[PDB]
Design a protein around this ligand. Sequence first.
Ligand code: CDL
Ligand code: BCL
Ligand code: BCL
Ligand code: BPH
Ligand code: BPH
Ligand code: U10
Ligand code: A1EFU
Ligand code: FE
Lengths: 51, 52, 51, 51, 52, 51, 51, 51, 274, 325, 256
Amino acid sequence: PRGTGMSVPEFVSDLDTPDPTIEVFLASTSDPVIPEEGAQTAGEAYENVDP
Amino acid sequence: MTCTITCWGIGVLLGIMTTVGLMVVGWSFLQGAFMGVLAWLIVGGVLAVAVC
Amino acid sequence: SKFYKIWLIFDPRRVFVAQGVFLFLLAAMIHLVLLSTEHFNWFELAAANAA
Amino acid sequence: SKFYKIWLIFDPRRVFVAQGVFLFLLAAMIHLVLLSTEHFNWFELAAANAA
Amino acid sequence: MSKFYKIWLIFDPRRVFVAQGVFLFLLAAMIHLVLLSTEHFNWFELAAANAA
Amino acid sequence: SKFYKIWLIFDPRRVFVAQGVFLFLLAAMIHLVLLSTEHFNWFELAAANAA
Amino acid sequence: SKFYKIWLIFDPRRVFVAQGVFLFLLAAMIHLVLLSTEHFNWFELAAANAA
Amino acid sequence: MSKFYKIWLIFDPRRVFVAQGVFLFLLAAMIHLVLLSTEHFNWFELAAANA
Amino acid sequence: ALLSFERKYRVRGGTLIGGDLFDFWVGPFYVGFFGVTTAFFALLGTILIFWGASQQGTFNPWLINIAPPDLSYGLGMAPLMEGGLWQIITICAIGAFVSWALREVEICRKLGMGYHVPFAFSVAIFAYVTLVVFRPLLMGAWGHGFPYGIWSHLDWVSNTGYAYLHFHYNPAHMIAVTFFFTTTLALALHGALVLSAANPPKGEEVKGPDNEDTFFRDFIGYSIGTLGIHRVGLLLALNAGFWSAVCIIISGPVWTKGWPEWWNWWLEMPIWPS
Amino acid sequence: PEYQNIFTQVQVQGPAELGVDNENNLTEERTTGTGFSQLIGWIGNAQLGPIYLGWFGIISLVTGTLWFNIVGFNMLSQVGYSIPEFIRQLFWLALEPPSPEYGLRMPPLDDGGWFIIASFFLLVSVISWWLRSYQLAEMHKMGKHVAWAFAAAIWLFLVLGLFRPILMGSWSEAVPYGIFPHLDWTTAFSIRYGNLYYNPFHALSIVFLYGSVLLFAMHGATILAVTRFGGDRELEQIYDRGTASERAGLFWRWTMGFNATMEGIHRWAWWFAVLTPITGGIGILLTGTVVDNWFLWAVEHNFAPDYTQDYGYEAYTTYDGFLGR
Amino acid sequence: MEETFFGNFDLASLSLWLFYGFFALLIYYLQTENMREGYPLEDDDGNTAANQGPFPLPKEKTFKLQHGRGELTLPGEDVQRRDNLALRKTAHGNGFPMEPTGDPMLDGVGPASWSKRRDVPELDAHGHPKIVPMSAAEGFGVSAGTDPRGLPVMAGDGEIVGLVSDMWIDEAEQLVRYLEIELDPEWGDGKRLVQREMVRIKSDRVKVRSIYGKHFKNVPKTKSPNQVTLLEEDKIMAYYAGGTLYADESRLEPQL
Ligand SMILES: CCCCCCCCCCCCCCCCCC(=O)OC[C@H](COP(=O)([O-])OCC(O)COP(=O)([O-])OC[C@@H](COC(=O)CCCCCCCCCCCCCCCCC)OC(=O)CCCCCCCCCCCCCCCCC)OC(=O)CCCCCCCCCCCCCCCCC
Ligand code: BCL
Ligand code: BCL
Ligand SMILES: CC[C@H]1c2cc3[nH]c4c(c3C)C(=O)[C@H](C(=O)OC)c4c3nc(cc4[nH]c(cc(n2)[C@@H]1C)c(C(C)=O)c4C)[C@@H](C)[C@@H]3CCC(=O)OC/C=C(\C)CCC[C@H](C)CCC[C@H](C)CCCC(C)C
Ligand SMILES: CC[C@H]1c2cc3[nH]c4c(c3C)C(=O)[C@H](C(=O)OC)c4c3nc(cc4[nH]c(cc(n2)[C@@H]1C)c(C(C)=O)c4C)[C@@H](C)[C@@H]3CCC(=O)OC/C=C(\C)CCC[C@H](C)CCC[C@H](C)CCCC(C)C
Ligand SMILES: COC1=C(OC)C(=O)C(C/C=C(/C)CC/C=C(\C)CC/C=C(/C)CC/C=C(\C)CC/C=C(/C)CC/C=C(\C)CC/C=C(\C)CC/C=C(\C)CC/C=C(\C)CCC=C(C)C)=C(C)C1=O
Ligand SMILES: COC(C)(C)C(=O)/C=C/C(C)=C/C=C/C(C)=C/C=C/C(C)=C/C=C\C=C(C)\C=C\C=C(/C)CC/C=C(\C)CCC=C(C)C
Ligand SMILES: [Fe+3]
């Protein structure tokens, strides 16, 4: 509520600076591949694959 | 006064110089300021006692 | 040519003390800001020049 | 050549003390600068040279 | 040009000289540092760019 | 060869007290910074030698 | 030699108390330093020796 | 060697004895506290250790 | 009315901008040009507080709460019932306080005494000014001022204090508090010194400055003197007001993080053998 | 500008003033050595006076050092006698009170046993110092106002560490002997018992604490304003008032409608200072023992404000908007 | 303890109301103790005012004055009242300032007004006069700061009136209380005292901005050159501060 000093002060420069690891994730992530009917699984393609 | 005030002025100038001198070689402003403040107390007091 | 009259209005002991502290602080400040720059840093240059 | 007249302006005791502590502080400051750098810090160089 | 000596009758020569003495240095130092602030007239980084 | 007359301007009891404080403080400071580095820390070298 | 002339400068009743507090403080500080190190902490060595 | 009696010609017996009495008790209390801190030399706790 | 000695000191003159137009006394109070503005600003601010209390729904002095606007309003004026009334009362409060200090200048100028009191009050004004108009500007919102309530402004101090994660570690708050405790300590000892000297046990002569001067010489080994205590005491109180202004002006616009984390410079130094 | 009497423009030094003395014969226990300091003379008297070596003072000094040392060596033992770590953590180390699971019983030395020993010596030193103030006023044939004003500080001192823990059922309620730790205790004490803002006696003590600083800025400036009329000589103005007392009174009579006398000012000055720990001592004494939650005490007594606005940041802004994206 | 009696009135409430009663008694005690000087109230005509306030005057307290100066009862018959004040009212009613009939500084009515103190010098613990010239001081000397002795005295308007001859020190508390001004024949005659709190000392000269050059010849004098009584001490200090408002019309007239 207005009045009571309930506020979170932050520097504008700090706010303008995002998390440096956000751009790292975007470079590593990728769109999922929707499986089709009768699609090969990791068990068939590779051996010693965890269940 | 006069001599004592001047000697204090030399210390605060030295304190400012040490504040930025340690900032150049690393440290931080607050860490450098404490050494600068400490330098001002020490050399400022010594100069105000020995020179005057 | 008549610059010698500056001592007629300035106390030689007062100006010399001011001159002495000013020159050293100016020399120290120029030296200090020089070390701040990476290019004009003889300490960092020697490490880079050696290896 | 006639620099001997500075003592007619500066008190010897007051100026000798002033430059007496100026030299030590300058020498300590220059020495401490060499500690800050890595190429001219003889303590780590001694450790590095000792394998 | 040379007839403006009447102004000096108002100022104390010591007071005006020390006031203008520190004024010129402060103005000169301020002009130098704003040249260091900009990315085009900072002669320290210009040497770095020139020397690659 | 004519340094004996430094005491003509310096009071012995006034400078001896300062010198005695300065020498011990300098000796302790050099000992302290020598203990800061791991190469010359004779207390840790003794521990490592007996290990 | 001729070191006895120091008493012509230093007051014996003011320097004896000066070294009296200094020697004990120096002795106490060095003892504390030894206690800080685990190699020379004779109190903890006795516990370790008993096992 | 045997001329140690002359220490009373400098120090008055009253002030040194009062300082000596406070120093010895504080030294005795300091050492006793140190042993009480260590688990090996805490004679009170090892009494509980012996059943 | 007048004291037994007040008649002589009641002379015309010693006014800043007013003249004989406002140069008169109402009862014991002295009205001046700035006493006119003080009366207007104080009454307007006081009435608007009760007008806001009426619209707030309660007249309980504990529960009356006129609060600054939301932070979304920024530095602009807010609706009167949404925080705008607090801004006007703040404007009235600044006018009332400044005029009160300027009136005190007129009081002491008429009496031929020094201007120490209005200067000392101005330090307390600066502490209020830095709390209500200086800190909000450095943050870009009038909503950072404390609300005008007996207990509401205690909630603001509590919330602002914990908004910086254990405010006790604020270095300027640390300096400001020890000035507050020392001033009260100095007030107790100084008040005790004069009363003890002037009021000895029954049947004993009153003690002069020498007897009270030597009491702390025998008590704490040094006495600052009759004149020294008043000037050191004024500086102790002014430093308390000034450092209180510092501890709150460096909270938000200088150190947005926690205050214990400020002390990381001491904990993390190259000298310390980590 | 006009000379403000903040720093003396010239100071004179003569023979050292030993004291006044009477048939109480304070000279034997009074030191014969005094010193002069010009740096402190710019604002006050330049003479470093001689201590009166009374037995209450000596006992207080000896036992006070014992408390100081005991806390110190436990602090030095906290970090294992590492002086650089001791200096680094000096503001953080403390001698913690006993654990709450011991009650009034004597706890082991490592778990607050040394706290009790240090507290006992601190109690003796503090009380002995008060007896020194009472005796010194008695030997000077002066009023005991210094002793009574000090006793008010003892009240909060005794409540914080002695009176409240005894009737709270545990020694753990005492204040830790640390720079930052007693700040942590100060905050944790308010948090544990609601909010000491809503403690009326804490509020009352704050009223007198602000008033004490307010008066001594008022009194300090007013005396310095009339110091051109010899207002610094308050005692002579009490016995025979001059224009300094009249102008100082009329300054505040014309400002706030009423004033004081040169003697009545110190009665006002004394009481707000004395009332600051007296009210605080009462509030701490009945905090937890009587009231265990001060905000809830405020709620039932109808002086806790109520807020009709939402309590979430989402109600005033959004996370993306705050970040500017 | 943890249980409440008649409602929500617990022991904390009982202590709070007990303090409220004590504080009300304390305020009555504190306010009354300040009524020992300047009361009963009066009006501008000098008669006793119809209103005396809500606080009655306290019981008579006695001070056993030292150095055989008798006793002193504060409430009643202030001996410091001045009889012949050179003022007359600017209004027939109350609450309006007085206008001095003659010279405000000479008569001492406004800021120049003094109080009829005792005509005896203030005494230290030894019984000797408290303020004495440094020439009569046994072993006193300037320890720090600028020594004003011999420095020319510059008035508020810039006139040079004379040089400082001596400083009247307070040997009991070891501080300077006055500066002796040896007036030049043009600006007056004899010596006059200026309090240290009203004087500003520079490197080469010493200046007072409160009094112009022409008013030093009218500064109140001292009967003896070795001591100053409280009456002269009050007259001297008041005169200099009176010039802060009466040196010229520009000071009395509004500054804006
Ligand atoms: C024009 C417009 C200008 C702006 C106006 C708008 C301002 C907005 C704010 C307004 C605030 C109020 C204004 C001030 C009042 C003005 C009155 C006035 O001008 O004429 C005065 C008028 C006399 O006419 P006069 O013009 O002065 O003529 C000269 C006199 O005849 C000759 O008699 P005298 O020589 O003896 O002098 C008279 C003097 C005599 O009075 C005194 O001696 C004062 C001494 C006590 C004051 C010191 C106490 C403060 C210490 C800390 C207080 C805070 C903590 C208290 C609570 C916690 C602890 C309980 O009276 C005064 O001068 C009044 C001064 C101000 C009084 C204190 C101000 C309030 C303080 C508390 C704050 C409350 C919040 C504000 C009020 C809310 C408004 C909405 O009547 C009075 O004297 C008032 C009576 C005094 C009050 C009673 C105090 C005695 C205490 C004992 C009883 C307490 C009972 C409570 C406890 C219950 C026990 C169970
Ligand atoms: C959780 C809370 C945090 C905390 C958070 C804060 C915050 C937040 C603040 C302080 C501030 C202060 N804190 Mg802190 N502080 C804490 C704990 C403490 C403790 C303690 C023992 O624990 C103490 C002693 C203090 C002490 C203080 C002082 C340094 C200061 C109080 C304001 C002041 O100086 O006046 C300053 C105010 C003024 C002088 C008011 C001026 C008054 C005007 C000019 C006149 C008023 C006239 C008015 C109209 C009345 C007239 C009406 C009648 C007619 C008479 N804090 C706790 C831990 N502290 C406050 C501060 O510094 O403010 C600058 C501040 O904002
Ligand atoms: C989050 C923190 C809590 C808080 C928790 C507490 C607690 C807990 C207490 C206070 C108390 C006080 N608080 Mg609070 N308080 C807070 C917020 C505030 C704020 C603010 C602006 O926010 C302020 C101004 C205050 C103000 C105050 C003072 C009114 C009061 C202490 C007076 C005092 O000094 O007693 C003077 C007495 C002492 C300080 C001890 C006396 C010391 C002895 C006599 C001297 C011994 C000397 C010693 C041996 C060392 C000697 C060494 C010498 C060098 C030789 N609090 C918030 C709510 N507050 C106290 C109280 O309640 O009073 C009722 C208290 O106990
Ligand atoms: C500032 C440095 C310290 C100090 C000094 C000081 N204060 C002073 C003086 C001095 C030297 C005066 O000369 C002056 C005076 O005359 O006091 C009697 C004064 C004064 N300081 C006062 C109070 C005060 N001082 C405080 C503290 C301090 N005093 C500081 C520690 C505090 C605190 C922090 O608690 C308070 C509350 C007054 C008694 C007085 C100022 C009188 C004045 O301003 O009168 C004119 C105004 C009115 C009569 C009413 C105005 C009303 C407004 C228009 C509306 C309301 C505004 C307000 C912000 C609302 C508050 C709501 C809630 C938060 C309660
Ligand atoms: C009315 C309430 C206010 C108040 C008043 C007050 N305090 C008082 C008095 C009064 C009237 C005194 O007369 C008394 C005094 O003498 O003051 C100068 C005092 C006092 N209040 C003090 C402090 C104090 N007051 C405080 C506050 C307050 N007290 C309130 C604001 C505070 C707070 C809450 O912050 C503190 C911390 C002291 C300055 C003093 C009490 C001292 C005293 O007489 O006994 C205490 C103990 C000692 C003197 C012994 C200490 C031990 C050593 C001197 C320290 C270590 C020395 C050295 C490092 C030894 C090393 C040995 C090794 C090398 C072996
Ligand atoms: C040794 O030296 C000294 C003294 O002793 C010579 C002293 O004493 C003092 C003073 C200190 C004391 C302790 C004395 C006693 C005082 C106190 C206990 C109070 C100080 C302590 C506090 C903790 C503060 C408490 C605050 C109080 C008591 C309130 C006082 C402050 C106020 C702002 C309220 C009073 C102001 C009012 C009512 C308004 C002012 C009036 C005007 C400006 C007049 C304007 C009028 C007009 C324009 C005309 C319109 C007229 C109207 C409407 C008619 C209405 C009439 C009215 C009267 C209102 C000091 C410092 C001192 O060192
Ligand atoms: C070179 O130095 C060496 C030598 C190393 C050294 O020592 C350095 C010492 C160093 C660094 C220690 C520095 C100490 C520090 C920072 C501590 C600050 C202290 C603080 C903040 C105190 C807060 C709390 C005070 C209260 C509130 C007490 C309450 C006391 C109560 C009232 C006592 C009541 C009595 C008892 C419980 C006993 C009951 C038993 C019996 C009666 C039998
Ligand atoms: Fe005072």
